């Protein structure tokens, strides 16, 4: 049997659940009959990105309709879709293409989870859970519910739950202190930067075996820069509300996972509108999309020398902005060091 604590066991069982991986793929409209979980390859996803990149170029620049048609057929043949009784939409709408780039981001993490799952499991001297936990190469520990560390994080969750996102409540079911192998080391050079904050990052539970083993990462070279609001970086938020929405939970599936990472922001390049950033301006270390609401700067605390914006959602003086909430993007995989993983319970208003 498992040596791990119960909460951790329930976590491993949850992130490695095969049923959830298929549910995700069905929601992305993949044909599971023609494309089973085990057919997924990194090479395959790379090519699909390249295809989406070209089609995006043809739409923007007015390429022949025959070109867009050919590209759509190649994409749908590479990744078989199931549209039921409806005709398959062509990749001719820039919003649909963006939807498809997001699908590939998720498939990258799902592919990692399955590969790990079917990996070295022959050992009989270990419990399956213990074996899969070790594959994550991440030390996971339960944060004590009554300690200061936990108190602060609960305060951060409660106080930063935005007004327009109050279509559900949020209960912190469990808090885990995570430490990925060799991550503290690759982040060492960034402790030299100022403006290091404890930000949020939400994602589907199906992405967590990938996030924990490979860490958070920027999209591959093949992905179109356009597929992302502020270019190809790593996104965070200061309002639990905003990140929580990327968990993709529902009334029928209410438990979501959410990360708290320390991010070395330094001098931020403030933007009020989207921008397909390739180069970062000299002297800038990250991008910050300004929102109409942000935690109250008065209430900002520190946790191990890291700023924690646990203030209540106050309206900022900026009005000419397109964003409702702030977004933080770093463009180097080493500018972040993951700290906590929270198990959240979304109570939907009925
Ligand atoms: C996947 C993800 N994306 C985000 C974003 O684009 C902006 C702000 C936050 C997030 C987040 O938490 N997760």
mmCIF file of C-alpha atoms and ligand atoms in Angstrom:
data_model
loop_
_atom_site.group_PDB
_atom_site.id
_atom_site.type_symbol
_atom_site.label_atom_id
_atom_site.label_comp_id
_atom_site.label_asym_id
_atom_site.label_seq_id
_atom_site.Cartn_x
_atom_site.Cartn_y
_atom_site.Cartn_z
ATOM 1 C CA UNK A 1 0.000 0.000 0.000
ATOM 2 C CA UNK A 2 0.688 3.745 -0.357
ATOM 3 C CA UNK A 3 2.965 5.587 2.059
ATOM 4 C CA UNK A 4 1.545 8.952 0.906
ATOM 5 C CA UNK A 5 -1.054 10.932 2.867
ATOM 6 C CA UNK A 6 -4.685 10.431 1.804
ATOM 7 C CA UNK A 7 -5.180 13.904 0.230
ATOM 8 C CA UNK A 8 -2.133 13.279 -1.996
ATOM 9 C CA UNK A 9 -3.396 9.830 -2.986
ATOM 10 C CA UNK A 10 -6.728 11.374 -3.989
ATOM 11 C CA UNK A 11 -4.749 13.961 -5.973
ATOM 12 C CA UNK A 12 -2.681 11.445 -7.957
ATOM 13 C CA UNK A 13 -5.787 9.371 -8.660
ATOM 14 C CA UNK A 14 -7.458 12.533 -9.906
ATOM 15 C CA UNK A 15 -4.731 13.854 -12.194
ATOM 16 C CA UNK A 16 -4.131 10.447 -13.786
ATOM 17 C CA UNK A 17 -7.798 9.562 -14.363
ATOM 18 C CA UNK A 18 -8.194 8.261 -17.886
ATOM 19 C CA UNK A 19 -11.902 9.081 -18.070
ATOM 20 C CA UNK A 20 -11.204 12.770 -17.650
ATOM 21 C CA UNK A 21 -8.636 12.737 -20.470
ATOM 22 C CA UNK A 22 -11.247 11.392 -22.880
ATOM 23 C CA UNK A 23 -13.920 13.779 -21.623
ATOM 24 C CA UNK A 24 -11.487 16.658 -22.433
ATOM 25 C CA UNK A 25 -10.850 15.347 -25.952
ATOM 26 C CA UNK A 26 -14.543 14.941 -26.644
ATOM 27 C CA UNK A 27 -15.183 18.538 -25.554
ATOM 28 C CA UNK A 28 -12.516 19.668 -28.047
ATOM 29 C CA UNK A 29 -14.590 17.638 -30.541
ATOM 30 C CA UNK A 30 -11.971 15.034 -31.363
ATOM 31 C CA UNK A 31 -13.167 11.750 -32.846
ATOM 32 C CA UNK A 32 -12.101 9.219 -30.225
ATOM 33 C CA UNK A 33 -12.910 6.312 -32.513
ATOM 34 C CA UNK A 34 -10.444 7.416 -35.204
ATOM 35 C CA UNK A 35 -8.141 9.112 -32.638
ATOM 36 C CA UNK A 36 -7.716 7.109 -29.420
ATOM 37 C CA UNK A 37 -5.750 8.375 -26.432
ATOM 38 C CA UNK A 38 -2.810 6.199 -27.442
ATOM 39 C CA UNK A 39 -2.407 7.582 -30.993
ATOM 40 C CA UNK A 40 -1.386 11.036 -29.736
ATOM 41 C CA UNK A 41 2.237 11.967 -30.467
ATOM 42 C CA UNK A 42 4.366 15.124 -29.956
ATOM 43 C CA UNK A 43 5.353 15.093 -33.628
ATOM 44 C CA UNK A 44 1.646 15.019 -34.565
ATOM 45 C CA UNK A 45 0.837 18.046 -32.384
ATOM 46 C CA UNK A 46 3.859 19.939 -33.763
ATOM 47 C CA UNK A 47 2.643 19.484 -37.326
ATOM 48 C CA UNK A 48 -0.898 20.517 -36.390
ATOM 49 C CA UNK A 49 0.532 23.747 -34.932
ATOM 50 C CA UNK A 50 2.421 24.400 -38.190
ATOM 51 C CA UNK A 51 -0.781 23.896 -40.156
ATOM 52 C CA UNK A 52 -2.712 26.287 -37.927
ATOM 53 C CA UNK A 53 0.146 28.765 -38.369
ATOM 54 C CA UNK A 54 -0.026 28.759 -42.169
ATOM 55 C CA UNK A 55 -3.861 28.938 -42.306
ATOM 56 C CA UNK A 56 -3.721 31.895 -39.901
ATOM 57 C CA UNK A 57 -1.284 33.570 -42.323
ATOM 58 C CA UNK A 58 -3.531 32.888 -45.353
ATOM 59 C CA UNK A 59 -6.633 34.332 -43.643
ATOM 60 C CA UNK A 60 -4.891 37.533 -42.499
ATOM 61 C CA UNK A 61 -3.113 38.142 -45.834
ATOM 62 C CA UNK A 62 -5.917 37.132 -48.192
ATOM 63 C CA UNK A 63 -4.481 33.827 -49.454
ATOM 64 C CA UNK A 64 -6.548 31.793 -51.964
ATOM 65 C CA UNK A 65 -9.687 30.116 -50.613
ATOM 66 C CA UNK A 66 -8.311 26.929 -52.163
ATOM 67 C CA UNK A 67 -5.292 27.295 -49.850
ATOM 68 C CA UNK A 68 -7.447 27.628 -46.718
ATOM 69 C CA UNK A 69 -9.509 24.642 -47.882
ATOM 70 C CA UNK A 70 -6.438 22.492 -48.399
ATOM 71 C CA UNK A 71 -5.023 23.463 -45.018
ATOM 72 C CA UNK A 72 -8.345 22.668 -43.268
ATOM 73 C CA UNK A 73 -8.456 19.206 -44.860
ATOM 74 C CA UNK A 74 -4.904 18.466 -43.774
ATOM 75 C CA UNK A 75 -5.625 19.607 -40.213
ATOM 76 C CA UNK A 76 -8.799 17.509 -39.954
ATOM 77 C CA UNK A 77 -6.945 14.487 -41.360
ATOM 78 C CA UNK A 78 -4.100 14.941 -38.898
ATOM 79 C CA UNK A 79 -6.526 15.377 -35.943
ATOM 80 C CA UNK A 80 -9.849 13.606 -36.742
ATOM 81 C CA UNK A 81 -12.893 15.562 -35.489
ATOM 82 C CA UNK A 82 -16.474 14.518 -34.956
ATOM 83 C CA UNK A 83 -19.048 17.157 -35.683
ATOM 84 C CA UNK A 84 -21.981 14.772 -35.466
ATOM 85 C CA UNK A 85 -24.626 15.551 -38.053
ATOM 86 C CA UNK A 86 -23.222 18.935 -38.934
ATOM 87 C CA UNK A 87 -20.807 19.957 -41.684
ATOM 88 C CA UNK A 88 -17.170 20.543 -40.456
ATOM 89 C CA UNK A 89 -16.311 24.249 -40.189
ATOM 90 C CA UNK A 90 -13.383 25.480 -42.258
ATOM 91 C CA UNK A 91 -10.395 27.027 -40.480
ATOM 92 C CA UNK A 92 -11.278 30.397 -42.049
ATOM 93 C CA UNK A 93 -12.387 32.278 -38.947
ATOM 94 C CA UNK A 94 -9.566 33.749 -36.827
ATOM 95 C CA UNK A 95 -11.510 32.974 -33.602
ATOM 96 C CA UNK A 96 -11.964 29.291 -34.510
ATOM 97 C CA UNK A 97 -8.239 28.999 -35.320
ATOM 98 C CA UNK A 98 -7.472 30.488 -31.860
ATOM 99 C CA UNK A 99 -9.866 27.930 -30.358
ATOM 100 C CA UNK A 100 -7.871 25.221 -32.166
ATOM 101 C CA UNK A 101 -4.482 26.521 -30.958
ATOM 102 C CA UNK A 102 -5.801 26.228 -27.383
ATOM 103 C CA UNK A 103 -6.847 22.605 -28.010
ATOM 104 C CA UNK A 104 -3.280 21.747 -29.052
ATOM 105 C CA UNK A 105 -1.886 23.443 -25.878
ATOM 106 C CA UNK A 106 -4.039 21.042 -23.829
ATOM 107 C CA UNK A 107 -3.298 17.990 -25.976
ATOM 108 C CA UNK A 108 0.414 18.550 -25.232
ATOM 109 C CA UNK A 109 -0.251 18.074 -21.561
ATOM 110 C CA UNK A 110 -2.719 15.213 -22.036
ATOM 111 C CA UNK A 111 -0.166 13.381 -24.178
ATOM 112 C CA UNK A 112 2.370 13.668 -21.304
ATOM 113 C CA UNK A 113 -0.095 12.249 -18.751
ATOM 114 C CA UNK A 114 -0.889 9.166 -20.826
ATOM 115 C CA UNK A 115 2.761 8.474 -21.670
ATOM 116 C CA UNK A 116 3.612 8.559 -17.990
ATOM 117 C CA UNK A 117 0.594 6.421 -17.110
ATOM 118 C CA UNK A 118 1.548 3.541 -19.400
ATOM 119 C CA UNK A 119 5.229 3.846 -18.432
ATOM 120 C CA UNK A 120 7.331 1.945 -15.894
ATOM 121 C CA UNK A 121 4.562 0.338 -13.846
ATOM 122 C CA UNK A 122 5.952 -3.198 -13.565
ATOM 123 C CA UNK A 123 7.260 -2.809 -10.001
ATOM 124 C CA UNK A 124 5.092 -4.927 -7.685
ATOM 125 C CA UNK A 125 6.926 -3.820 -4.524
ATOM 126 C CA UNK A 126 5.239 -0.379 -4.818
ATOM 127 C CA UNK A 127 1.561 0.696 -4.806
ATOM 128 C CA UNK A 128 0.364 2.033 -8.216
ATOM 129 C CA UNK A 129 -0.306 5.426 -6.590
ATOM 130 C CA UNK A 130 3.209 5.594 -5.142
ATOM 131 C CA UNK A 131 4.610 4.666 -8.538
ATOM 132 C CA UNK A 132 2.703 7.400 -10.390
ATOM 133 C CA UNK A 133 3.552 9.966 -7.706
ATOM 134 C CA UNK A 134 7.246 9.271 -8.250
ATOM 135 C CA UNK A 135 6.844 9.789 -12.027
ATOM 136 C CA UNK A 136 5.927 13.404 -11.321
ATOM 137 C CA UNK A 137 9.383 14.079 -9.810
ATOM 138 C CA UNK A 138 7.669 16.646 -7.608
ATOM 139 C CA UNK A 139 7.742 16.562 -3.851
ATOM 140 C CA UNK A 140 4.181 17.192 -2.604
ATOM 141 C CA UNK A 141 3.270 17.982 1.010
ATOM 142 C CA UNK A 142 0.044 18.921 2.750
ATOM 143 C CA UNK A 143 -0.042 22.453 4.130
ATOM 144 C CA UNK A 144 -1.531 22.513 7.627
ATOM 145 C CA UNK A 145 -5.020 24.007 7.489
ATOM 146 C CA UNK A 146 -4.484 26.085 10.640
ATOM 147 C CA UNK A 147 -1.018 27.513 9.963
ATOM 148 C CA UNK A 148 -0.220 31.117 8.966
ATOM 149 C CA UNK A 149 0.853 29.915 5.505
ATOM 150 C CA UNK A 150 -2.636 28.483 4.920
ATOM 151 C CA UNK A 151 -4.443 31.420 6.556
ATOM 152 C CA UNK A 152 -2.823 33.854 4.138
ATOM 153 C CA UNK A 153 -3.648 31.721 1.077
ATOM 154 C CA UNK A 154 -7.305 31.415 2.136
ATOM 155 C CA UNK A 155 -7.404 35.203 2.583
ATOM 156 C CA UNK A 156 -5.966 35.550 -0.942
ATOM 157 C CA UNK A 157 -8.672 33.238 -2.322
ATOM 158 C CA UNK A 158 -11.587 34.913 -0.518
ATOM 159 C CA UNK A 159 -10.644 38.591 -0.980
ATOM 160 C CA UNK A 160 -9.782 38.328 -4.709
ATOM 161 C CA UNK A 161 -12.973 36.625 -5.958
ATOM 162 C CA UNK A 162 -14.227 39.205 -8.529
ATOM 163 C CA UNK A 163 -17.773 40.678 -8.725
ATOM 164 C CA UNK A 164 -18.673 39.620 -12.302
ATOM 165 C CA UNK A 165 -17.418 36.038 -11.664
ATOM 166 C CA UNK A 166 -19.831 35.522 -8.774
ATOM 167 C CA UNK A 167 -21.761 32.850 -10.641
ATOM 168 C CA UNK A 168 -20.130 30.501 -8.080
ATOM 169 C CA UNK A 169 -18.435 30.449 -4.677
ATOM 170 C CA UNK A 170 -15.050 28.925 -3.948
ATOM 171 C CA UNK A 171 -14.024 26.651 -1.112
ATOM 172 C CA UNK A 172 -10.420 25.667 -0.590
ATOM 173 C CA UNK A 173 -10.640 21.884 -0.115
ATOM 174 C CA UNK A 174 -6.900 21.298 0.319
ATOM 175 C CA UNK A 175 -3.543 23.136 -0.025
ATOM 176 C CA UNK A 176 -0.313 21.451 -1.137
ATOM 177 C CA UNK A 177 3.256 22.747 -0.923
ATOM 178 C CA UNK A 178 4.927 21.512 -4.154
ATOM 179 C CA UNK A 179 8.602 21.534 -5.087
ATOM 180 C CA UNK A 180 9.520 20.382 -8.624
ATOM 181 C CA UNK A 181 12.877 18.671 -9.115
ATOM 182 C CA UNK A 182 15.601 21.155 -10.016
ATOM 183 C CA UNK A 183 13.191 24.122 -10.396
ATOM 184 C CA UNK A 184 14.497 26.127 -7.433
ATOM 185 C CA UNK A 185 17.919 25.927 -9.111
ATOM 186 C CA UNK A 186 16.884 27.183 -12.549
ATOM 187 C CA UNK A 187 15.020 30.029 -10.877
ATOM 188 C CA UNK A 188 17.964 31.094 -8.675
ATOM 189 C CA UNK A 189 19.210 33.854 -11.032
ATOM 190 C CA UNK A 190 15.814 35.590 -10.738
ATOM 191 C CA UNK A 191 15.855 36.069 -6.988
ATOM 192 C CA UNK A 192 17.994 39.081 -7.996
ATOM 193 C CA UNK A 193 14.937 40.746 -9.592
ATOM 194 C CA UNK A 194 12.549 43.072 -7.791
ATOM 195 C CA UNK A 195 8.759 42.883 -7.957
ATOM 196 C CA UNK A 196 8.554 39.148 -7.372
ATOM 197 C CA UNK A 197 4.914 38.261 -6.718
ATOM 198 C CA UNK A 198 2.787 35.213 -5.770
ATOM 199 C CA UNK A 199 0.365 34.875 -8.691
ATOM 200 C CA UNK A 200 -2.350 32.465 -9.817
ATOM 201 C CA UNK A 201 -2.518 29.974 -12.704
ATOM 202 C CA UNK A 202 -5.591 27.859 -13.462
ATOM 203 C CA UNK A 203 -5.837 24.923 -15.868
ATOM 204 C CA UNK A 204 -7.829 21.709 -16.489
ATOM 205 C CA UNK A 205 -7.054 18.850 -14.138
ATOM 206 C CA UNK A 206 -5.996 16.880 -17.213
ATOM 207 C CA UNK A 207 -2.998 19.194 -17.634
ATOM 208 C CA UNK A 208 -1.499 18.642 -14.210
ATOM 209 C CA UNK A 209 0.542 15.509 -14.757
ATOM 210 C CA UNK A 210 2.141 17.582 -17.524
ATOM 211 C CA UNK A 211 2.517 20.779 -15.500
ATOM 212 C CA UNK A 212 4.061 18.965 -12.527
ATOM 213 C CA UNK A 213 6.518 16.830 -14.532
ATOM 214 C CA UNK A 214 7.581 19.370 -17.183
ATOM 215 C CA UNK A 215 6.659 22.525 -15.269
ATOM 216 C CA UNK A 216 4.692 25.382 -16.842
ATOM 217 C CA UNK A 217 6.022 26.168 -20.327
ATOM 218 C CA UNK A 218 5.754 28.490 -23.336
ATOM 219 C CA UNK A 219 4.126 27.263 -26.576
ATOM 220 C CA UNK A 220 6.477 25.600 -29.124
ATOM 221 C CA UNK A 221 8.130 27.401 -32.079
ATOM 222 C CA UNK A 222 5.462 26.099 -34.449
ATOM 223 C CA UNK A 223 2.512 27.750 -32.689
ATOM 224 C CA UNK A 224 1.309 31.046 -34.200
ATOM 225 C CA UNK A 225 2.064 34.088 -32.066
ATOM 226 C CA UNK A 226 -1.470 35.223 -32.881
ATOM 227 C CA UNK A 227 -2.981 32.317 -30.963
ATOM 228 C CA UNK A 228 -2.166 34.213 -27.784
ATOM 229 C CA UNK A 229 -3.226 37.598 -26.424
ATOM 230 C CA UNK A 230 0.225 38.851 -25.398
ATOM 231 C CA UNK A 231 2.322 36.447 -27.396
ATOM 232 C CA UNK A 232 3.972 33.156 -26.462
ATOM 233 C CA UNK A 233 4.696 33.384 -22.732
ATOM 234 C CA UNK A 234 3.355 32.073 -19.415
ATOM 235 C CA UNK A 235 0.189 33.687 -18.046
ATOM 236 C CA UNK A 236 -0.802 34.495 -14.470
ATOM 237 C CA UNK A 237 -3.431 36.575 -12.689
ATOM 238 C CA UNK A 238 -3.849 38.356 -9.351
ATOM 239 C CA UNK A 239 -7.598 37.737 -8.999
ATOM 240 C CA UNK A 240 -8.416 34.058 -8.144
ATOM 241 C CA UNK A 241 -11.610 34.669 -10.117
ATOM 242 C CA UNK A 242 -9.807 35.087 -13.473
ATOM 243 C CA UNK A 243 -7.587 32.025 -13.216
ATOM 244 C CA UNK A 244 -10.382 29.908 -11.746
ATOM 245 C CA UNK A 245 -12.188 30.214 -15.085
ATOM 246 C CA UNK A 246 -9.452 28.289 -16.873
ATOM 247 C CA UNK A 247 -10.132 25.287 -14.641
ATOM 248 C CA UNK A 248 -13.170 24.502 -16.808
ATOM 249 C CA UNK A 249 -15.203 23.068 -13.921
ATOM 250 C CA UNK A 250 -19.020 22.858 -13.853
ATOM 251 C CA UNK A 251 -22.041 21.875 -11.805
ATOM 252 C CA UNK A 252 -21.410 18.246 -12.830
ATOM 253 C CA UNK A 253 -17.602 18.440 -12.262
ATOM 254 C CA UNK A 254 -16.952 20.934 -9.407
ATOM 255 C CA UNK A 255 -13.416 20.191 -8.157
ATOM 256 C CA UNK A 256 -10.669 22.197 -9.839
ATOM 257 C CA UNK A 257 -6.912 22.505 -9.277
ATOM 258 C CA UNK A 258 -5.082 25.846 -9.243
ATOM 259 C CA UNK A 259 -1.440 26.812 -8.819
ATOM 260 C CA UNK A 260 0.260 29.601 -6.912
ATOM 261 C CA UNK A 261 3.635 30.406 -8.387
ATOM 262 C CA UNK A 262 6.297 32.919 -7.449
ATOM 263 C CA UNK A 263 6.943 35.014 -10.534
ATOM 264 C CA UNK A 264 9.948 37.266 -11.101
ATOM 265 C CA UNK A 265 8.280 40.225 -12.811
ATOM 266 C CA UNK A 266 10.901 42.961 -12.474
ATOM 267 C CA UNK A 267 10.073 46.030 -14.607
ATOM 268 C CA UNK A 268 6.705 45.401 -16.266
ATOM 269 C CA UNK A 269 5.789 46.553 -19.796
ATOM 270 C CA UNK A 270 2.226 47.858 -19.181
ATOM 271 C CA UNK A 271 -0.348 47.392 -21.960
ATOM 272 C CA UNK A 272 -4.022 48.405 -22.149
ATOM 273 C CA UNK A 273 -4.781 46.306 -25.229
ATOM 274 C CA UNK A 274 -3.701 42.975 -26.751
ATOM 275 C CA UNK A 275 -0.321 42.851 -28.438
ATOM 276 C CA UNK A 276 1.402 40.013 -30.237
ATOM 277 C CA UNK A 277 4.718 40.534 -28.518
ATOM 278 C CA UNK A 278 7.834 38.909 -29.972
ATOM 279 C CA UNK A 279 10.535 41.124 -28.491
ATOM 280 C CA UNK A 280 10.540 42.589 -24.988
ATOM 281 C CA UNK A 281 11.678 46.263 -24.718
ATOM 282 C CA UNK A 282 15.117 46.859 -23.172
ATOM 283 C CA UNK A 283 14.809 47.083 -19.429
ATOM 284 C CA UNK A 284 11.539 45.169 -19.300
ATOM 285 C CA UNK A 285 11.255 41.696 -17.725
ATOM 286 C CA UNK A 286 7.557 40.848 -18.283
ATOM 287 C CA UNK A 287 4.241 42.165 -19.650
ATOM 288 C CA UNK A 288 1.264 43.358 -17.623
ATOM 289 C CA UNK A 289 -2.188 43.725 -19.137
ATOM 290 C CA UNK A 290 -3.982 46.397 -17.093
ATOM 291 C CA UNK A 291 -7.499 45.704 -15.869
ATOM 292 C CA UNK A 292 -10.388 47.733 -14.493
ATOM 293 C CA UNK A 293 -10.221 45.773 -11.224
ATOM 294 C CA UNK A 294 -7.213 44.676 -9.155
ATOM 295 C CA UNK A 295 -6.554 43.834 -5.506
ATOM 296 C CA UNK A 296 -6.258 46.821 -3.168
ATOM 297 C CA UNK A 297 -2.550 47.819 -3.078
ATOM 298 C CA UNK A 298 -3.059 48.891 0.544
ATOM 299 C CA UNK A 299 -3.527 45.270 1.690
ATOM 300 C CA UNK A 300 -0.472 43.745 -0.029
ATOM 301 C CA UNK A 301 1.487 41.349 2.265
ATOM 302 C CA UNK A 302 4.645 39.284 2.001
ATOM 303 C CA UNK A 303 5.234 35.546 2.287
ATOM 304 C CA UNK A 304 8.928 34.626 2.397
ATOM 305 C CA UNK A 305 9.887 37.967 0.822
ATOM 306 C CA UNK A 306 7.372 37.595 -2.000
ATOM 307 C CA UNK A 307 4.578 40.091 -2.527
ATOM 308 C CA UNK A 308 1.063 38.676 -2.077
ATOM 309 C CA UNK A 309 -1.746 40.937 -3.535
ATOM 310 C CA UNK A 310 -4.451 39.638 -1.181
ATOM 311 C CA UNK A 311 -6.297 42.964 -1.136
ATOM 312 C CA UNK A 312 -10.015 43.179 -1.975
ATOM 313 C CA UNK A 313 -11.068 43.811 -5.575
ATOM 314 C CA UNK A 314 -10.859 47.583 -5.976
ATOM 315 C CA UNK A 315 -11.454 49.470 -9.225
ATOM 316 C CA UNK A 316 -8.275 50.960 -10.723
ATOM 317 C CA UNK A 317 -8.224 54.489 -12.119
ATOM 318 C CA UNK A 318 -7.600 53.267 -15.661
ATOM 319 C CA UNK A 319 -10.618 53.427 -17.973
ATOM 320 C CA UNK A 320 -9.185 53.157 -21.523
ATOM 321 C CA UNK A 321 -8.303 49.488 -21.048
ATOM 322 C CA UNK A 322 -9.813 46.458 -22.788
ATOM 323 C CA UNK A 323 -9.183 44.047 -19.867
ATOM 324 C CA UNK A 324 -11.435 43.603 -16.809
ATOM 325 C CA UNK A 325 -8.602 42.086 -14.783
ATOM 326 C CA UNK A 326 -4.785 42.199 -14.882
ATOM 327 C CA UNK A 327 -2.775 39.545 -16.723
ATOM 328 C CA UNK A 328 0.906 38.883 -16.160
ATOM 329 C CA UNK A 329 3.122 37.274 -18.761
ATOM 330 C CA UNK A 330 6.752 36.198 -18.449
ATOM 331 C CA UNK A 331 8.630 34.996 -21.550
ATOM 332 C CA UNK A 332 11.232 32.791 -19.922
ATOM 333 C CA UNK A 333 10.366 29.422 -18.431
ATOM 334 C CA UNK A 334 12.869 30.186 -15.571
ATOM 335 C CA UNK A 335 11.094 33.346 -14.364
ATOM 336 C CA UNK A 336 8.655 31.203 -12.385
ATOM 337 C CA UNK A 337 8.947 28.879 -9.406
ATOM 338 C CA UNK A 338 5.770 26.965 -8.415
ATOM 339 C CA UNK A 339 4.887 27.036 -4.702
ATOM 340 C CA UNK A 340 1.376 25.784 -3.886
ATOM 341 C CA UNK A 341 -1.302 23.673 -5.569
ATOM 342 C CA UNK A 342 -4.811 24.197 -4.230
ATOM 343 C CA UNK A 343 -7.736 21.798 -4.552
ATOM 344 C CA UNK A 344 -10.770 24.015 -5.023
ATOM 345 C CA UNK A 345 -14.491 23.218 -4.765
ATOM 346 C CA UNK A 346 -16.680 25.425 -7.013
ATOM 347 C CA UNK A 347 -20.102 25.801 -5.440
ATOM 348 C CA UNK A 348 -22.414 26.859 -8.274
ATOM 349 C CA UNK A 349 -25.353 29.160 -7.602
ATOM 350 C CA UNK A 350 -28.592 27.285 -8.341
HETATM 351 C C1 LIG B 1 -4.335 28.907 -18.988
HETATM 352 C C2 LIG B 1 -4.429 30.167 -18.193
HETATM 353 N N1 LIG B 1 -4.453 31.286 -18.819
HETATM 354 C C3 LIG B 1 -4.540 32.492 -18.173
HETATM 355 C C4 LIG B 1 -4.557 33.747 -18.891
HETATM 356 O O1 LIG B 1 -4.498 33.820 -20.299
HETATM 357 C C5 LIG B 1 -4.650 34.953 -18.159
HETATM 358 C C6 LIG B 1 -4.710 34.941 -16.750
HETATM 359 C C7 LIG B 1 -4.693 33.718 -16.040
HETATM 360 C C8 LIG B 1 -4.608 32.499 -16.756
HETATM 361 C C9 LIG B 1 -4.592 31.146 -16.080
HETATM 362 O O2 LIG B 1 -4.650 31.084 -14.850
HETATM 363 N N2 LIG B 1 -4.500 30.057 -16.862
#
